[PDB]
Amino acid sequence: MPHAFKPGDLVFAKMKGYPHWPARIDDIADGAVKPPPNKYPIFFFGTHETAFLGPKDLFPYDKCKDKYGKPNKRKGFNEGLWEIQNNPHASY
């Protein structure tokens, strides 16, 4: 059975106006800004932007990569596809 999301989990994350995007649940560094309640810091591969999202917008990477893990014209998407497959836990 599924668990709650945790830092390091790999997802496709959905934001309005954007395709489902390769991302991870980030950790929160000591002294860094915390997200609102029931939100997670989502690091977007390729663009390297962070947003605060709830689970409604988070799709598991392994289960959903066949649907969402295809090249896309948006800037940074294909770099992000490379990152999530080849070094998703690196420092960016």
Side-chain angles (χ1 to χ4, degrees), residues 1-72 74-92:
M1 272 325 196
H3 318 109
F5 282 106
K6 58 178 195 294
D9 286 346
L10 306 181
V11 298
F12 292 88
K14 184 68 175 66
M15 311 224 59
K16 216 212 189 168
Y18 289 105
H20 299 76
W21 200 285
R24 63 185 190 201
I25 314 278
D26 249 2
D27 261 295
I28 303 148
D30 279 337
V33 173
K34 286 179 292 187
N38 294 321
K39 302 295 185 69
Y40 292 89
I42 302 307
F43 177 83
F44 285 87
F45 293 113
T47 74
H48 316 116
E49 275 289 283
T50 294
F52 297 138
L53 300 186
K56 73 179 183 75
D57 286 321
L58 303 178
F59 296 74
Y61 175 69
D62 57 4
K63 161 182 161 68
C64 290
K65 61 183 167 198
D66 268 38
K67 195 177 189 186
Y68 297 137
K70 319 211 107 63
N72 180 288
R74 300 292 257 284
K75 173 176 280 186
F77 194 95
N78 297 337
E79 184 177 8
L81 287 179
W82 179 93
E83 293 176 353
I84 192 160
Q85 179 162 29
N86 297 304
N87 212 328
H89 306 294
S91 317
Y92 287 95

